[PDB]
C-alpha cells in the first residue's frame, strides 16, 4: 500500500545517514542538504565521531536544520554568518555566533573544554 | 632440538623488542640450550606483556581520543592489541591533534591562525609538523609585529623600549611584550604627571 | 559453622569479640548482662597453650558486640571488656564488661552433659564455605559422638564443620523452647571452609560449667 | 587446630602456587576471585598468571597483598587507595578514581618496576 505524498519536513534518508556517517538528523525547513566535502563545501562540521566530518549546502535563505552531532569541536563558514546552538552534558544550551569566511571552535576546542553536542544549525 | 640459527633470531628480538622480551633474550643468549627453550616457550606471552605496557602508557599520556582507545585496548585479545598498537591508535591520535590545532587558532594571533587553519585542512603529517615546530614559528612572527606596532603607536618610553627589543632576539621581544612595555608605560605616565 | 543465616530473637544472646585492631577475633555468648563467656585461647599468645591467660585486665583493648546478627546495621550493643576470669582447668574464660546490656537476656546453662547421639546446634560468626568473613551469623547442626573428661566431642551432620572464628561460640541444646548451653567451641578440623579443605567435620568443645559461672558472676 | 581468626588470608599458600600472587593480613572483607563478569577491583602485572580480581564484601575494607612488577588497576563503583613501592624501598600512595583505569611506575610517570604493597577500599 502506497504512502501519502505529504511533506513532514523529516530529513529524507536520515535512517541511512545514521547508519553510514554516524550523524543523525531530525526536522528542518528543507533548505539545507547533506553532501560530500569535495570542492562543494559551504558549512562544514568537524567532530571526533562517526565518519570524522561532513558538509552541508545552503539552497536558500533563511534556513535551519536541527541535526545532532555528538562531540563536535570545529566549524567552517563561507559567504555567510552562522548561528550555532550547542548543549553541555548537564543539559544546558548556549549560542555561539560564528563570523563569515572564518573558523571557530566549540567547548572541546573552546574556552570550557567541554565535550558538547551540536543541537541546531541556523543560516542567517 | 633447536634451530641452527635460533640464537641469531633471539639476538634479533634483543635488539628490537620491549624491556620484557629483551631481558628474557639475554638469559637465553648468555645461557645454554635449556635457557633458549625456556625463552621460546614464554616469548609469545612476554611480547604480549610488553604490548600491554605501551598501551597502558598511552592511556595516561595521550589526549582524550587516544586515552580512551588505549584504555579499552589493554583489555583486548593479543591479536587485537597488536592491531591497535600497529595502526589502530593512529586515528585517535590524529583527532587529538585536530582539536589542539583548532584551540590554538581561537586563541592565537594572525600568524598562528593562518598557519593553524592551513594545518587543519591538510594531512596528518602537516598537522604534526605544525604542532611540533610550526606553531612556535608562527607565534614569533606575531610577537615581532606587535613590538613593531608599539614602536610606532605608543608613547616616548614605549616607543624607545620597543625599538630596542625589536632589534634584539625573540627572547627580548617576548620579555618586552610580557613585562617591559608595562614598565615603559608607567614611565610615560610618570612623565605626563610630573610635566602637568 | 556452615548453614542458614539467622537473625531471629532466639539466639540474640550471642556475641562477637575482637582483640586489638587486627590481632585476634573469635565468638562468644552471654551468661549475664555484664558477663560474656568465651574461650581462653582467644587471649593467649599461643592459642594451643591457654595456660598463661591470667586473670585481670586484657593484654590488648578488647571490644564485644552483642545481638548484632547483621554486621551491616547498627542493631546491637557495643561494650568494652575490662576484666578476664579464666577457668582454673580448661579453655574457658569469663569476660567482664564495663557496662551491662539489660536489654539482651543470657542463655541458661545446662545441668549436665549431652550423651552420644544427642542433636546439638551451634551458632557463631566464623568462616563459611565461601566467605572469609560473613555479614550475618549462621546456625549449624552437630551430633555428639562421645563425652570425655570435662569436654564433649561432636561432629557435623551432613557436612557443616566447625571452622575458624567459632572459638568461644556456644553449643546449644533446646527442649520445649528452652535453650541451655552445653559447651563452648575450642578446636575443629575445619572441613568445608573457604580457603581450605579436609574431609573430617569433627570438633571438640569445653563442657559447660554452671558452678564456675555462678561463683564468678555472683562473686 | 584452634578455631581462632588470625586475619591471615585463607588459601594464600595455594594462591602463591597457582597464581603467583601472595597475600598476608586484612580485615577479611576482600576475597580473591575469578575475572569472568564478576569483576570489581582488578590488578594487572607481568608476573604470575598475568592478572586476577578481588571482590569487596563490605566497606571499609583492606588487604595487604603483594604483587611484584605491577603496572595497572581497574576500579568500579568505588575509589581505590593504592600503596606501591619502588626498588629503593620508597613507598608512595596513588588515589584511583571510581570507574576508571590508572597505571603504576612501569606504565606511569616514572617508568619504575614498582610493587603493589597495599590495596585499600574507601
Q: According to the 3-state scheme, what is the secondary structure of chain B?
A: CCCCCHHHHHHHHHHHCCHHHHHHHHHHHHCCHHHHHHHHHHHHHHHHHHHHHHHHHHHHHCCHHHHHHHHHHCCCCHHHHHHHHHHHCHHHHHHHHHHHHHHHHHHCCHHHHHHHHHHHCCCHHHHHHHHHHHHHHHHHHHHHHHHHHHHHHCCHHHHHHHHHHHCCCHHHHHHHHHHHHHHHHHHHHHHHHHHC
Q: Can you say how many angstroms the Cα of residue C70 is from the centroid of all Cα atoms in its chain? A: 17
- Residue A109: which of B65, B106, B117 has the nearest Cβ? B106
Using CA atoms, how far residue B170 sits from B104, B105, B143, B145, D116, in Å, is: 20, 21, 8, 11, 48
- Residue D71: which of B45, B56, B71 has the nearest Cβ? B56
Cell of A37: 566535502
* Chain D hits for B85, Cβ within 8 Å: none
Q: Are D30 and D23 in contact (CB under 8 A)?
A: no
Q: Are C8 and C67 in contact (CB under 8 A)?
A: no
DSSP secondary structure letters along chain C:
--S-B---TTSTTEEEEEETTTTEEEEEEESSSSEEEE-SGGG-SSTT-TTS--SBS-SS-EEEEES-SBTTS--SEEEEEEEEEE-SSSS-EEEEESS--TTSPPPEEPSS---TT-EEEEEES---SS-SS-SB-EEEEEEEEEEETTEEEEEESSS----TT-TT-EEEEEETTEEEEEEEEEEE--TT-TT---S--EEEEEEP-HHHHHHHHT-
Q: Are C151 and C207 in contact (CB under 8 A)?
A: yes
Q: Give me the phi and psi of C111, to 5 degrees please.
A: -80, -25
D58 interfaces chain C, CB cutoff of 8 Å = yes
Mark yes or no for CB contact A74/B120 under 8 Å.
Answer: yes
Method: cryo-EM
Q: Are D91 and D84 in contact (CB under 8 A)?
A: yes
Instruction: Give the DSSP letter of residue A88.
Output: -
Sheet of strand D51-56, all strands in order from the earlier edge strand to the far edge: D30-33, D51-56, D41-45, D70-74, D101-103
B20 interfaces chain D, CB cutoff of 8 Å = yes
Query: Which has the closest alpha carbon to B92: B73, B118, B107?
Result: B73
- Residue B106: which of A48, A52, A105 has the nearest Cβ? A105
Beta D70-74 vs C202-207: how paired, if at all? unpaired
Q: How many beta-carbon pairs under 8 angstroms link C with D? A: 78
Distance from the Cα of D101 to chain B's closest Cα (Å) equals: 7
* Alpha carbon distance C122, B183 (integer Å): 87
Q: Are D85 and D115 in contact (CB under 8 A)?
A: yes
Mark yes or no for CB contact A48/B100 under 8 Å.
Answer: no
Beta C178-188 vs C108-109: how paired, if at all? parallel
* Chain B hits for A52, Cβ within 8 Å: 95
> What subunits make at least 3 CB pairs under 8 angstroms with B?
A, D
* Chain D hits for B45, Cβ within 8 Å: 50
Q: Are D3 and C162 in contact (CB under 8 A)?
A: yes
Mark yes or no for CB contact D3/C194 under 8 Å.
Answer: no
What is chain B's length? 196
* Chain A hits for B118, Cβ within 8 Å: none
Touching status, chains D and C (3+ beta-carbon pairs under 8 Å): yes
Long-range contacts: B148-152, Cβ < 8 Å, 24+?
B150/B181
Q: Are A98 and A104 in contact (CB under 8 A)?
A: yes
The CA angle B37-B42-B44, to the nearest 5 degrees, is 120
* Chain A hits for B65, Cβ within 8 Å: 48
Q: Are D77 and D67 in contact (CB under 8 A)?
A: no
> What subunits make at least 3 CB pairs under 8 angstroms with A?
B
Cell of B184: 615603559
Instruction: Report chain B's C-alpha Rg in angstroms.
Output: 28
Residues of B (52-71) whose Cβ lies below 8 Å from A: 64-65
Q: Are D58 and C134 in contact (CB under 8 A)?
A: no
- CA nearest to B71 within chain D: D101
* Alpha carbon distance A44, A65 (integer Å): 14
Q: Which residues contact C13 (CB under 8 A, 6 or more apart)?
A: C29, C30, C66, C67, C104, C105, C106, C107
Q: How many beta-carbon pairs under 8 angstroms link B with D? A: 32
Distance from the Cα of B196 to chain A's closest Cα (Å) equals: 44
Resolution in A for the shown PDB structure?
4.3
Instruction: Give the DSSP letter of residue D47.
Output: S
* Chain A hits for B100, Cβ within 8 Å: 109
Q: How many beta-carbon pairs under 8 angstroms link A with B? A: 35
- Residue B102: which of A52, A109, A115 has the nearest Cβ? A109
- Beta-ladder partners of C205: C152, C185
Distance from the Cα of B167 to chain A's closest Cα (Å) equals: 34
Distance from the Cα of A7 to chain B's closest Cα (Å) equals: 37
**Distinct helix (H) and strand (E) counts, chain A:** 1, 9
Q: Are D109 and D94 in contact (CB under 8 A)?
A: no
Q: Which residues contact B135 (CB under 8 A, 6 or more apart)?
A: B104, B108, B112, B115, B116
* Chain B hits for A110, Cβ within 8 Å: 103, 106
* Alpha carbon distance D82, B140 (integer Å): 45
Distance from the Cα of B53 to chain D's closest Cα (Å) equals: 6
Amino acid at each position: 500500500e502506497m504512502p501519502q505524498a505529504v511533506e513532514d519536513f523529516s530529513y529524507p534518508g536520515a535512517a541511512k545517514i545514521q547508519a553510514e556517517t554516524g550523524a543523525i538528523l531530525k526536522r528542518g525547513n528543507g533548505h539545507m542538504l547533506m553532501t560530500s566535502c569535495d570542492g562543494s563545501e559551504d558549512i562544514q562540521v568537524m567532530s571526533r565521531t562517526g565518519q570524522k566530518d561532513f558538509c552541508f549546502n545552503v539552497m536558500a535563505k533563511p534556513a535551519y536544520l536541527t541535526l545532532e552531532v555528538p562531540q563536535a569541536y570545529g566549524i567552517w563558514t563561507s559567504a555567510d554568518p552562522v548561528k550555532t546552538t550547542i548543549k553541555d552534558t548537564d543539559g544546558t544550551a548556549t549560542v555561539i555566533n560564528a563570523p563569515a569566511n572564518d573558523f571557530t571552535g566549540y567547548g572541546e576546542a573552546g574556552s570550557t573544554g567541554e565535550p558538547t553536542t551540536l543541537i541546531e544549525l541556523r543560516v542567517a | 632440538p633447536l634451530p641452527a640459527n635460533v640464537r641469531a633470531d633471539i639476538v634479533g628480538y634483543w635488539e628490537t623488542g620491549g624491556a620484557g622480551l629483551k631481558a628474557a633474550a639475554e638469559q637465553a643468549l648468555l645461557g645454554g640450550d635449556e635457557a633458549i627453550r625456556k625463552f621460546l616457550a614464554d616469548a609469545p606471552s612476554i611480547q604480549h606483556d610488553d604490548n600491554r605496557i605501551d598501551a597502558a602508557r598511552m592511556a595516561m599520556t595521550g589526549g582524550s581520543g587516544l586515552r580512551q582507545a588505549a584504555k579499552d585496548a589493554i583489555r583486548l585479545s593479543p591479536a587485537e592489541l597488536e592491531k591497535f598498537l600497529l595502526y589502530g591508535y593512529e586515528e585517535p591520535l590524529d583527532d587529538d591533534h585536530k582539536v589542539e590545532i583548532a584551540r590554538l587558532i581561537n586563541l592565537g594571533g594572525p600568524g598562528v591562525r593562518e598557519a593553524g587553519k592551513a594545518a587543519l585542512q591538510g594531512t596528518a603529517e602537516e598537522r604534526e609538523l605544525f604542532l611540533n615546530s610550526g606553531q612556535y614559528t608562527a607565534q614569533q612572527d606575531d610577537n615581532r609585529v606587535d613590538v613593531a606596532r608599539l614602536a610606532t603607536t605608543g608613547g616616548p618610553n614605549v616607543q624607545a623600549a620597543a625599538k630596542v627589543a625589536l632589534r634584539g632576539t625573540p627572547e627580548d621581544m617576548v620579555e618586552f611584550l610580557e613585562v617591559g612595555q608595562f614598565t615603559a608605560r608607567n614611565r610615560d605616565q610618570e612623565h605626563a604627571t610630573i610635566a602637568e | 559453622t556452615v548453614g542458614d543465616p539467622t537473625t531471629d530473637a532466639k539466639l540474640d544472646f550471642t556475641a562477637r569479640l575482637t582483640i586489638g585492631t587486627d590481632y585476634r577475633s573469635c565468638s562468644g555468648a552471654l551468661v549475664d548482662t555484664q558477663w560474656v563467656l568465651t574461650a581462653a585461647s582467644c587471649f593467649a599468645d599461643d592459642p594451643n597453650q591457654p595456660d598463661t591467660v591470667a586473670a585481670g585486665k586484657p593484654a590488648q583493648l578488647t571490644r564485644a558486640t552483642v545481638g548484632r546478627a547483621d554486621s551491616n546495621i547498627a542493631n546491637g550493643y557495643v561494650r568494652e571488656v575490662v576484666e578476664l576470669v579464666p577457668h582454673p582447668e580448661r579453655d574457658m574464660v569469663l569476660a567482664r564488661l564495663d557496662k551491662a546490656i539489660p536489654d539482651i537476656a543470657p542463655v541458661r546453662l545446662a545441668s549436665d552433659a549431652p550423651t552420644a547421639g544427642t542433636p546439638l546446634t551451634a551458632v557463631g560468626f566464623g568462616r563459611t564455605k565461601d566467605e572469609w568473613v560473613p555479614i550475618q551469623r549462621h546456625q549449624g547442626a552437630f551430633t555428639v559422638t562421645s563425652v570425655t573428661a570435662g569436654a564433649v566431642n561432636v561432629t557435623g551432620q551432613g557436612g557443616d564443620a566447625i571452622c575458624a572464628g567459632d572459638t568461644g561460640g556456644p553449643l546449644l541444646q533446646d527442649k520445649n523452647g528452652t535453650l541451655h548451653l552445653v559447651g563452648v567451641n575450642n578446636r575443629s578440623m575445619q572441613g568445608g571452609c573457604y580457603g581450605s579443605e579436609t574431609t573430617s567435620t569433627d570438633a571438640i568443645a569445653a563442657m559447660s560449667d554452671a558452678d564456675f559461672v555462678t561463683q564468678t558472676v555472683n562473686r
